[PDB]
Design a protein that fits this description.
Blueprint lengths: L6 E2 L4 E3 L12 E3 L5 H4 L10 E3 L1 H10 L7 E3 L6 E3 L2 E7 L7 E6 L5 E4 L21 E4 L13 H18 L3 E7 L5 H10 L4 E2 L2 H8 L10 E2 L7 E5 L5 H10 L6 E8 L16 E3 L2 E7 L6 H11 L3 E4 L6 H18 L2
Parallel strand pairs: 2-3, 3-4, 4-5, 9-10, 10-18, 11-14, 11-15, 12-13, 12-14, 15-17
Antiparallel strand pairs: 1-2, 6-7, 7-8, 8-9, 16-17
Helix pairs in contact: 3-4
Bound molecules: nickel (II) ion (NI).
The site of nickel (II) ion has 4 residues, from loops.
């Protein structure tokens, strides 16, 4: 059965609620983004209206085979009427196609559901500037002050410089990047661009990237692995055994691998600056863990919320333990006393 924080009161709507069968009273199911924890349940057999971005719609059609008649893509930044209720979709700064949803309820209440997001000051100049929000359904993934990490731009600078230096010293090195979902495509795109290479990958991953509306994509990716010196592999293969095994397949073209595992936050963020990061190395294989996040840092979250001044906050992440719930409520009250709302 569907939990409370996935329902939008005073509507027939749910958000990211596909794993509970038929939800009583639901006339439209919204999907914020194409990540498995959120789409869990959708398939070719789904017969209710799905509302989402264009990119999420391309993924539902091609990857999950949802029929065309049930996919309802909406443009961003545009007031739309769904089942008699005004909605807006906004860019969430998460993965490709990810949105926040603003709902203008019939009784005058305004609700923002962030989905998964990486808060940014640019959001203070969207359609949110205008107006009051009575309820915030908030992505609280990193809602504690120990969660620190650098800007995506600093992390990409480190990856480009690391890869460019290694391949310039050794023209016979291969670069490998781990993936297990959509998101974080800038990591492998930026490395391939500095090296003058296309990115090589499986047919399944290629299909996924072809759904993403990335400009000039045909110029950037390929299924011909042998033509490419940046390869993508599933994240589970990014270890010394999996990488050794991969090097055997390349027919004596390469004599070194440099590999990247983009992660979220890890405890080494508590101690080591991005500049000072070093790899794990065995023989001719080196593996870098790089902290490329598509969720808000504590400080980014706090700034967004103190700006928005919502009347009530409903967390959507870390809701399963009393200690997590209590900790998050304490921070919401500090923020509110500090800023005065
Ligand atoms: Ni996500």
């Amino acid at each position: 059965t569907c939990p409370f924080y996935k329902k939008i009161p005073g509507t027939g709507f749910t958000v990211d609620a596909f794993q509970y069968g038929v939800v009583e009273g639901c006339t439209a199911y919204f999907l914020t983004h194409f990540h498995s924890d959120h789409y869990a349940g959708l398939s070719k057999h789904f017969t209710f209206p799905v509302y989402c971005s264009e990119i999420t719609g391309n993924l539902l059609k091609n990857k999950l085979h949802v029929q065309e008649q049930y996919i309802h893509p909406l443009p961003l930044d545009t007031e739309c009427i769904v089942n008699g209720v005004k909605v807006v979709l906004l860019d969430a700064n998460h993965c490709p196609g990810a949105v926040m949803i603003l709902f203008y309820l019939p009784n005058g209440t305004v609700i923002l559901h962030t989905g998964d997001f990486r808060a940014d000051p640019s959001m203070e100049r969207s359609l949110l500037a205008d107006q009051k929000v009575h309820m915030l359904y908030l992505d609280t993934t990193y809602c504690s002050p120990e969660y620190t990490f650098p800007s995506q731009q600093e992390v990409i600078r480190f990856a480009i410089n690391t890869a460019f230096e290694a391949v310039t010293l050794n023209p016979h090195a291969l670069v490998v990047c781990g993936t297990y979902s959509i998101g974080k495509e800038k990591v492998f795109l930026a490395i391939a661009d500095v090296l003058g290479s296309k990115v090589g990958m499986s047919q399944e991953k290629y299909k996924t990237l072809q759904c993403l509306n990335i400009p000039e994509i045909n110029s950037l990716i390929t299924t011909d692995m042998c033509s490419s010196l940046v390869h993508l592999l599933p994240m589970m293969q990014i270890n010394f055994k999996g990488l050794q095994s991969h090097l055997k397949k390349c027919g004596g073209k390469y004599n070194q691998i440099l590999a990247f595992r983009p992660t979220g936050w890890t405890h080494s963020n508590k101690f080591t600056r991005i500049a000072d990061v070093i790899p794990q190395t065995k023989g001719n294989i080196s593996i870098y863990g790089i902290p490329y996040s598509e969720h808000s840092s504590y400080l980014e979250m706090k700034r967004f919320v103190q700006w928005l001044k919502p009347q009530k906050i409903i967390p959507t992440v870390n809701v399963g333990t009393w200690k997590s719930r209590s900790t998050m409520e304490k921070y919401f009250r500090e923020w509110k006393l500090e800023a005065g709302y």
